[PDB]
Design a protein around this ligand. Structure first.
Ligand SMILES: CCCCCCCC/C=C\CCCCCCCC(=O)O[C@H](COC(=O)CCCCCCCCCCCCCCC)COP(=O)(O)OCCN
Ligand SMILES: CCCCCCCC/C=C\CCCCCCCC(=O)O[C@H](COC(=O)CCCCCCCCCCCCCCC)COP(=O)(O)OCCN
Ligand SMILES: COc1ncnc(OC)c1C(=O)Nc1nc(C(F)(F)F)c(-c2ccnc(C(C)(C)C#N)c2)s1
Ligand SMILES: COc1ncnc(OC)c1C(=O)Nc1nc(C(F)(F)F)c(-c2ccnc(C(C)(C)C#N)c2)s1
Lengths: 606, 73, 204, 71
């Protein structure tokens, strides 16, 4: 039991003399060699060495325990397999002692380890360290450097990165390198105090080149595209607007001031993986990707806001107005064909226009539907166009029901103009408010009102006798239901001689319906709408801006290659010794932060 | 949706009277007959109920809520 | 086992988990002489106990209870509507009778052992109206229809109880209840004073 | 009431949960019985209820644990 005695005296550490006696025992025994010396100091189940066991359980004397441990392992010249050992369990695989010393924040022990040959490129290629479900697993990046950086140990990060054998460019099993990992664990300032932006800057500058920021994980995302997918708007704003004054590190920036004078400064933001000219850009991801709902803040970041405004004012404003004009005349032709139906040259042109515009919307929103609240509008545009072409089909046959589909298509098209309200900010914010009210208030009201209307309609229809003579408005369930609805909208009259056999119960139930709807439900709808309207007013400009951004990017994808290349925001800019990357000037004015400007590329401010 | 009757048997006959009938509904004024000489009376009733929801339930109460926001600012 | 950000605690559950007489969970959920039950429910051992109970059996017992009350109410509704002015029919009619007796004894026991119990009262009154209606119908009493329509009406009202299964609908219901108490009843009193005084004033 | 409705609903649903649990028969109550017994001290072995959690601001070397290997 010498193995278990050493294990207990090392994980407990009551004294160094206990472990010294046990180690003298093991040395005087095993020589009677390295392999089974280890087997007499190992955990043959998981592979956990007594160095691992000591590090797992740090006591006030651990830096001496582990020191005697490795000095023994070096006196027997087994140090290599000793301090570089790894777990064999399927859930902690590849975990060495250094992952332990770093997770435990034991900077001194980790320094002693890697000073004595601790393999630092060791990957925590394990189901705990590479989690699938939260709270069983901690995703940090599967390396000692990614652990030291994600657990906010800048001293251990500096100590690891200064090591000649740490491999900062190494990627984990998920494809991530240290910078993807930092982006994933980046939470917020609310829950993390924003140390990850600092570790990101430190690691990127301490490896001064683009190798880290350019690598894509197994999802095909760089740290920047990942910071956009996951809605990390702080690390994204940090990367997007990264300006390094260092002359030896001026090629690792994304935005470089080129002519600032006083209050006015003209910047030159880098637009490489940001401007919709690549596969999944930061702008495209920031506008589209809907698995976050954190697209809120990411859209006003300095290059993206100006890219969207350049796209709008270059082509998308006009494509949107042209799209609106086409939908408007399509709807007017549907309206006039419905109205002037039978109970030419410019006529037939309009009729085939609705047919072909219906087929175009059909194929477009059908393609866009199979490639899938934001797409309510794909559904209704598709359903409207389908109703139009179905109406045309039933009309070129001898089917009279073409008018049902045609009037429904006309109705739904006029509803679909709520889409085009997103061209203006006033009307667009009004529409996101209408939509929020319909979802949060009106549908809840309609459900409750229909359970009232239907229950009271059957109650009041049940109370009514059979007259031999139409002497009751509440005779059937439907007729009753009909004028409970009429009562709600205050339309007819109210006769309370309804041929009931229990007229006081009939009147009690009618008064109860009136209270429940008129007094309670409708006024409570007003109160709840007032609560919705006040909450949605604080986010409606954000939601409208996101809607218009999605529309801008939809229109940009419609353009043909020559037109997309013709528009192409951002002018190429001499930015470093030889970088010459597409950039996007954004002049700005600041009055509080006074300083002598040394960073520029044109010392003369245009 | 309304057919041609041979007799005044529909309030929604022309666009104007239909427009007048809808306006009366919003202000709560006339009666509501739903036998309007439509050929698709369930679609007529669906569209009438939809108008009532959109105006009575949504637009007028949302006007109250928006006025409440204006008045406070 | 805490590692980095993730730490796994092991809360003790000895006098906390409804397996003893008056547990901390039972007292925290029930005891109504404080109205300070606000904050206590979210405490860590307790909050996870209620969610484990919900997702282990109570979600399903609640949906099953709702389904039984719903078909009980639908049978009351259809028996009211299709009253006279079978095999699957008589099954439904005796179903309302026995479900009414079960609710009767349950909410009567729960009433004698006593705003939170509005619902005991209305569930009991509804079930009593149903069994009274059945009694008046197996006799030759025509007033069974008054009790039956009132029972149907009150049962559809009692579904506001089952709205507490979802958070959206459940919060909407506590809001409806608060509005009815704080606003609608005050309105109804004042409106009746005005309606009755002006009615006598105008009739005069 | 919007500021307290989630609290009130949660209390209502808790009362319903505890009402249903009292309806169950003894074998079903014992069958459900949240919380797994846990070696917790030298000899305590009290029923316990694991609740994993994540914290990013309070950094410290962890000395309190009973399984030094995090599952
Ligand atoms: C489900 C049923 C929903 C019913 C609620 C719908 C309420 C919607 C109400 C009215 C819809 C009216 C739509 C207004 C359309 C506004 C016109 C418009 O935006 O034009 C477009 C924008 O033009 P532009 O691009 O800014 O100018 C470029 C000039 N070259
Ligand atoms: C005094 C007069 C009161 C009248 C005011 C009532 C207002 C309207 C109230 C109720 C309308 C009827 C609503 C019935 C709601 C039924 C909801 C329901 O299905 O519950 C069920 C729940 O199933 P679950 O599996 O527990 O759900 C868990 C999912 N996370
Ligand atoms: C969700 O509600 C429903 N859903 C579908 N159908 C329904 O009825 C067909 C119902 C329903 O509420 N029925 C009712 N029964 C009764 C009872 F008289 F029996 F008490 C009701 C009543 C009685 C006395 N004062 C009220 C007020 C309005 C003051 C309150 N609060 C209501 S209301
Ligand atoms: C609790 O109130 C009641 N409850 C039961 N029955 C009632 O009356 C039958 C009443 C009641 O209000 N009676 C009233 N009498 C008079 C008076 F004209 F004689 F002065 C009233 C009056 C007079 C002048 N201007 C107002 C307005 C509306 C402008 C105001 N403010 C109200 S009001």
């Amino acid at each position: 039991r010498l193995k278990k005695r050493i294990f207990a005296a090392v994980s407990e550490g009551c004294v160094e003399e206990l472990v010294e006696l046990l180690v003298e025992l093991q040395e005087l025994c095993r020589r009677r060699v390295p392999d089974f010396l280890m087997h007499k100091l190992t955990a043959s189940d998981t592979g956990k060495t007594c160095l691992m066991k000591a590090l797992l359980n740090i006591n006030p004397n651990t830096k001496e325990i582990v020191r005697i441990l490795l000095a023994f392992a070096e006196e027997n010249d087994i140090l290599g397999r000793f301090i570089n050992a790894e777990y064999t369990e399927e859930a902690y695989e590849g975990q060495t002692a250094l992952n332990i010393a770093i997770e435990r924040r034991q900077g001194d022990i980790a320094a002693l380890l890697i000073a004595a040959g601790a393999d630092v490129n060791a990957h925590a290629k394990g189901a705990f360290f590479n989690p699938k479900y939260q709270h069983e697993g901690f995703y940090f990046g599967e390396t000692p450097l990614a652990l030291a950086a994600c657990t906010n140990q800048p001293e251990i990060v500096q100590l690891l990165m200064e090591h000649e054998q740490t491999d900062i460019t190494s990627r984990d099993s998920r494809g991530n390198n240290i910078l993807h990992a930092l982006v994933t664990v980046a939470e917020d300032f609310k829950t993390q105090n924003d140390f990850v932006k600092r570790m990101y800057d430190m690691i990127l500058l301490r490896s001064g080149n683009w190798e880290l920021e350019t690598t894509r994980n197994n999802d095909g995302l760089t740290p920047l595209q990942l910071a956009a997918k996951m809605g990390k708007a702080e690390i994204l704003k940090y990367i997007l607007s990264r300006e390094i004054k260092e002359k030896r590190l001026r090629s690792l920036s994304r935005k470089f001031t080129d002519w600032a004078y006083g209050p006015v400064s003209s910047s030159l933001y880098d637009l490489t993986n940001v401007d919709t000219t690549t596969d999944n850009s930061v702008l495209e991801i920031t506008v589209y990707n809907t698995n976050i709902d954190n697209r809120h803040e990411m859209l006003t970041l300095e290059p993206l806001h100006t890219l969207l405004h350049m796209k709008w004012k270059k082509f998308a404003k006009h494509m949107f107005f042209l799209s609106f004009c086409f939908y408007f005349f399509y709807n007017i032709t549907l309206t006039l064909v419905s109205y002037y139906r039978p109970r030419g040259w410019l006529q037939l042109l309009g009729r085939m226009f609705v047919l072909i515009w219906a087929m175009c919307i059909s194929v477009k929103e059908g393609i866009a539907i199979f490639l899938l609240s934001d797409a309510w509008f794909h559904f209704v545009f598709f359903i409207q166009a389908v109703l139009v072409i179905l109406s045309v089909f039933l009309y070129l046959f001898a089917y009279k029901e073409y008018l049902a589909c045609l009037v429904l298509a006309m109705a739904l098209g006029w509803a679909n103009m709520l889409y085009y309200t997103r061209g203006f900010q006033s009307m667009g914010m009004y529409s996101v408010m209408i939509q929020k009210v319909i979802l949060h208030d009106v549908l809840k009201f309609l459900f409750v009102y229909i359970v009232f209307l239907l229950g009271f309609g059957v109650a009041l229809a049940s109370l009514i006798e059979k007259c031999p003579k139409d002497c009751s408005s509440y005779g059937s369930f439907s007729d009753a239901v009909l004028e409970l609805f009429k009562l709600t909208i205050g339309l007819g009259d109210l006769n309370i001689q309804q041929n009931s056999k229990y007229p006081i119960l009939f009147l009690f139930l009618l008064i109860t319906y009136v209270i429940l709807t008129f007094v309670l439900l409708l006024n409570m709808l007003i109160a709840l709408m007032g609560e919705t309207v006040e909450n949605v007013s604080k986010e409606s400009e954000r939601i409208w801006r996101l809607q218009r951004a999605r529309t801008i990017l939809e229109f940009e994808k419609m353009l043909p290659e020559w037109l997309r290349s013709r528009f192409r925001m951002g002018e190429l800019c001499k930015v470093a010794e030889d970088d010459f990357r597409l950039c996007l000037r954004i002049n700005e004015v600041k009055w509080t932060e006074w300083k002598t400007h040394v960073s520029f590329l044109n010392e003369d401010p245009g």
